[PDB]
Design a protein around this ligand. Structure first.
Ligand SMILES: Nc1nc2c(ncn2[C@@H]2O[C@H](COP(=O)(O)OP(=O)(O)O)[C@@H](O)[C@H]2O)c(=O)[nH]1
Lengths: 91, 307
């Protein structure tokens, strides 16, 4: 039904300056995740970091309160080249 | 100017190609080839080809490799004109079925007679699929071998090592779409998205023509050891497990990075490969370019002439 990996993605804890995102467990072993976030519609280069493939949460710190953000999680697996999932958040 | 075509043969072959069409492979042409006329409209491939206007009544050759082979042998002209002008063809089929096990060696024979570089990428069925289905797919692979330059076999039982618990049937099955796609996308992209150490088509024909049985493995990695680690994941891959890497007549390597690839990362991948392969083998190492990639690496290895 949903083509990407991860297939679900939400913010599960939300201060005004830091977010705990969470995604579903993958059917197929992920090596690591690429995690990117920027202001929705921005010219600054997006920030990105990696979390081990065993993880299903990520903390994005140092955010600007009441600022609109677009988060993207890529699953990097040696078994596929699947596409990312994405969400938008304020505060 | 090179023409690459991918043929999804059968019901599960067209499944994988439908997923390659949705996920996009750049600079290739996708065809779907099957007896089942119903599911041959319920797919947005763009090029549909039913084998057997007559020998089948638009129905499906269920678990049927006899008339599946005959269904194919009945429009060897329909195949030929969709092939014409190809430098390279990928035949993607689910082995152990009916329509896919009998037509794929026929499909491959036509492309071989047109002088098209014929690579077949096919999947050995699972466990829960049973022993009549798996022993089917042995007779296809040995009939396919007599009509291909290179035959990449991926056994689906290898996937259950990276498939978690409680994954459904559909999960186990899109997962086999992806290994087919990766086997096509990691070869074709040396041609379609070449990087700064390029593998042209002639280098590809050389590693892969009249070579027979082939196996492949991939790795990804980021950070400071992405090259050593992606290479280790590829040489160690389970999809490659059964093969003495040293015993292949050829090795084709595709390093997929995006600009920030260091001179000594290419070093690392190369020497790792050169250590696990024969000094006499046709060893072809190059890169493909994905500019959307940063601080991460992908390595793809196909060992050819393993038979
Ligand atoms: N990747 C993938 N493999 C499939 C699919 N359907 C079937 N297979 C595999 O192919 C074998 C036979 O299915 P199928 O290809 O539909 O039979 P056929 O089309 O009549 O040759 C099974 O053992 C499956 O493991 C699919 O949609 N995708």
């Amino acid at each position: 039904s949903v083509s990407s990996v991860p297939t679900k993605l939400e913010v599960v804890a939300a201060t005004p300056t830091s977010l705990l995102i969470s995604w579903d467990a993958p059917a197929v072993t992920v090596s690591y995740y690429r995690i990117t976030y920027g202001e929705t519609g921005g010219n600054s280069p997006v920030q990105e970091f990696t979390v081990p493939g065993s993880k299903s949460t990520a903390t994005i710190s140092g955010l600007s309160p009441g600022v609109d953000y677009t988060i993207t999680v890529y699953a990097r697996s040696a078994y596929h080249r699947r596409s990312p999932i994405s969400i938008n958040y304020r505060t | 100017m090179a023409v690459i075509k991918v043929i999804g043969v059968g019901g599960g072959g067209g499944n994988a190609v439908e997923h390659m069409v949705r996920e996009r492979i750049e600079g290739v042409e996708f065809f779907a080839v099957n007896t089942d006329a119903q599911a041959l409209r319920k797919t947005a491939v763009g090029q549909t080809i039913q084998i057997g206007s007559g020998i089948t009544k638009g129905l499906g050759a269920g678990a049927n490799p006899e008339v599946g082979r005959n269904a194919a042998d009945e429009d060897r002209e329909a195949l030929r004109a969709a092939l014409d002008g190809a430098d390279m063809v990928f035949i993607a089929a689910g082995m152990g079925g009916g329509t896919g096990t009998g037509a794929a060696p026929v499909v491959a024979e036509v492309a071989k007679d047109l002088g098209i570089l014929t690579v077949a990428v096919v999947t050995k069925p699972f466990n829960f699929e049973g022993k009549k289905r798996m022993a089917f797919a042995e007779q296809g692979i040995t009939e396919l071998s007599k009509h291909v330059d290179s035959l990449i076999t991926i056994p689906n039982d290898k996937l259950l090592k990276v498939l978690g618990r409680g994954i459904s049937l559909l999960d186990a099955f899109g997962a086999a779409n992806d290994v087919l796609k990766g086997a096509v996308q990691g070869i074709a992209e040396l041609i379609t998205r070449p990087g700064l150490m390029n593998v042209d088509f002639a280098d590809v024909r050389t590693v892969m023509s009249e070579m027979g049985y082939a196996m492949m493995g991939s790795g990804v990695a980021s950070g400071e050891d992405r090259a050593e680690e992606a290479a280790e994941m590829a040489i160690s891959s389970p999809l490659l497990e059964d093969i003495d890497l040293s015993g292949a007549r050829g090795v084709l390597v595709n390093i997929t990075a995006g600009f920030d690839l260091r001179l000594d990362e290419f070093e690392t991948v190369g020497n790792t490969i050169r250590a696990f392969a024969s000094d006499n083998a046709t060893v072809v190492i190059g890169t493909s370019l994905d500019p959307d990639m940063n601080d991460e690496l992908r390595v793809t290895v196909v060992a050819t002439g393993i038979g």
